[PDB]
Design a protein around this ligand. Sequence first.
Ligand SMILES: [K+]
Ligand SMILES: [K+]
Ligand SMILES: [Mg+2]
Ligand SMILES: [Mg+2]
Ligand SMILES: [Mg+2]
Ligand SMILES: [Mg+2]
Ligand SMILES: [Mg+2]
Ligand SMILES: [Mg+2]
Ligand SMILES: [Mg+2]
Ligand SMILES: [Mg+2]
Ligand SMILES: [Mg+2]
Ligand SMILES: [Mg+2]
Ligand SMILES: [Zn+2]
Lengths: 178, 46, 83, 118
Amino acid sequence: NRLKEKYNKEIAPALMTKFNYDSVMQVPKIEKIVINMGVGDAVQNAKAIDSAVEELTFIAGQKPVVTRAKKSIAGFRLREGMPIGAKVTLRGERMYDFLDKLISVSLPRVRDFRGVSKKSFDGRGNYTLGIKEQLIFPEIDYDKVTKVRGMDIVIVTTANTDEEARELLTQVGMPFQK
Amino acid sequence: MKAGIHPNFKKATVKCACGNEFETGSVKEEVRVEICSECHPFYTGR
Amino acid sequence: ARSLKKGPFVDGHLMTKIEKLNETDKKQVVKTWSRRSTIFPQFIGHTIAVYDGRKHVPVFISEDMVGHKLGEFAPTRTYKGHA
Amino acid sequence: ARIAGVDIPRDKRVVISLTYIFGIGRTTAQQVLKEAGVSEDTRVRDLTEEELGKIRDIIDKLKVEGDLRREVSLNIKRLIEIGSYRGIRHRRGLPVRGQNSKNNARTRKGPRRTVANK
RNA sequence: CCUCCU
RNA sequence: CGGGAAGUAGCUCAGCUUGGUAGAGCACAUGGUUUGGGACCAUGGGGUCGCAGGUUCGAAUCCUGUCUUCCCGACCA
RNA sequence: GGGCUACACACGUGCUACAAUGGACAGAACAAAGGGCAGCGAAACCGCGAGGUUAAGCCAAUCCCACAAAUCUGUUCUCAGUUCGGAUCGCAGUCUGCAACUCGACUGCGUGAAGCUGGAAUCGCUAGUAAUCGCGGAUCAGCAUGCCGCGGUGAAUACGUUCC
RNA sequence: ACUGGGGCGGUCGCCUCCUAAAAGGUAACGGAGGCGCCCAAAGGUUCCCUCAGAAUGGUUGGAAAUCAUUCGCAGAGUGUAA
Ligand SMILES: [K+]
Ligand SMILES: [K+]
Ligand SMILES: [Mg+2]
Ligand SMILES: [Mg+2]
Ligand SMILES: [Mg+2]
Ligand SMILES: [Mg+2]
Ligand SMILES: [Mg+2]
Ligand SMILES: [Mg+2]
Ligand SMILES: [Mg+2]
Ligand SMILES: [Mg+2]
Ligand SMILES: [Mg+2]
Ligand SMILES: [Mg+2]
Ligand SMILES: [Zn+2]
């Protein structure tokens, strides 16, 4: 799609010049996008997962895997092996198709949107942004949603540093806070 | 992509009422948005 | 809200003192009883010591304080909870 | 239909449905629709894309939702920062407009927490 | 059931 | 000295044996009733389970130590 | 100058509600009793409005305050914490006043809380009464859900005297 | 029955550690704990794999749920005592 073509033709040659790499193989790319929904109210409500899956299914376009509890935790009333979340890993076209829709369409629909933060890099050039409403995604219908619930969206990149990752994401339409 | 388990995913075409047009991949056949990157003010600048 | 036709109110005595300091770059504590006087733009930076009822409370003026009456920064009652 | 980042009620009339936007009441909803030239009796579900477009453009001029909520927040924040009497009433959760507090300040105070009488 | 003292 | 048993709201007691929920009576508080009390009626709130350590995802509950208070025993010479 | 306007809380008296015998909007109506001289102030014009400017008439069965409102008839809403409710708060005003921070009323725009008819208990009323709807006045520059008056619409029930 | 006299208290079979003197064995009413099962997979085999914890970022979401990266002889796990 347009963003993959934009990456190869425009962004990657620019980053080569920008950072003055020896090889084109050094140019940072987006590896994968992991979308996570933590669903701790699955402890209480059994159908919370079934719903949360269905939302994430349409948003991403792949069937999510249902994550389970690594430990029992008393504070949360969590037992080991309980379904308490759902992730989906996006690579290739399904990744760029998603990331295009995120930037082009969904992040505009965020209520009172004033850019995504410049702080939210991990220190090694991976970006994570927290969505609050699943209503922003155009596949999600307003009427069908009952329980409102957000998600984490990890953008993993081959950038070693934040400034290299920042550049790549800025070169994509991603609206960083001015 | 192991067959059966996933939803149907195909050409889409998103359309800003504001005028912008482009074709992503999605579940819906005709996506119609009332806002996008080119219309929204953070992106444009006001 | 005082009428616009009347314009913002201030006691002559207070205003004259602050204007007298504004003649130069002088800054002194203007102790006063005029809680009803509006804080005019040209008060900014002064330390007007407003009478609360029993003492002169020192009030350093800011830009945000313009519009408000001097009494708004010198609360009259003393309350710090029951029990 | 979503307007100003708010999915308004579809089954209700537009004068009413527009008031579900924060920053719009009956008079503002009247005065937009007048300016758009949409009938007040029409349902939101039975609007055209022409009509919605014209409504959206009008409401985009008006300060609504977070734009408004931020303004209100800073106004109240200013009063606290300067240490105005009203600011002190805001933080302490008491009447700000001279309403007497010996009785009946329950909206500000919240529900009662009874204490032993003498 | 009870109803302080002068 | 040896062996038991308790220790949970202001007071008296359940819950412990089966790990996941802190209860009950009186008292306390507010209202009502009465000229006013009492009684009665209505409506509430109150510990974190002696202390420490352990096992457990999780301890009033299971394990250990300690403290306090009781009870029983200390015989043949 | 401040306080009598404080606010963990408890009680008394009220006002407004919780909606469809209703809300909103529009069109027809039908009162009484009062007040007015530096006072009442029409009409006209301007302002979304509170109001402003200007000014007729009237020391009043003459003029002004003054607009009755419930109601009736349409239209819309269709049982929703809502087109119910209107607290609270932000912003912008108006008026009086030397001056509305503490501490005025009113207006516009925005906000849109509790509340789905109230436990034990408890109050008023026997008829133009109760209930409900407006209107006026004293005090008063300004400030009334209070008080004192005024009319509109207009019930139910009383077997009976045992008990309180 | 044992018993630093007997009674009374405690114990009695099995497993693990220390005492135990670097093979094995080794006593005391010496020091510490377990067992009288459990699992139809928690067994067999083939194939694939790597754990605790921390830091940093991230909706709800906290000290701690799930996600991502980095560091990480193991600081985990191995039904259960060692
Ligand atoms: K001996
Ligand atoms: K197997
Ligand atoms: Mg008052
Ligand atoms: Mg008084
Ligand atoms: Mg209303
Ligand atoms: Mg009578
Ligand atoms: Mg008056
Ligand atoms: Mg023997
Ligand atoms: Mg012996
Ligand atoms: Mg024996
Ligand atoms: Mg040896
Ligand atoms: Mg050996
Ligand atoms: Zn656009």
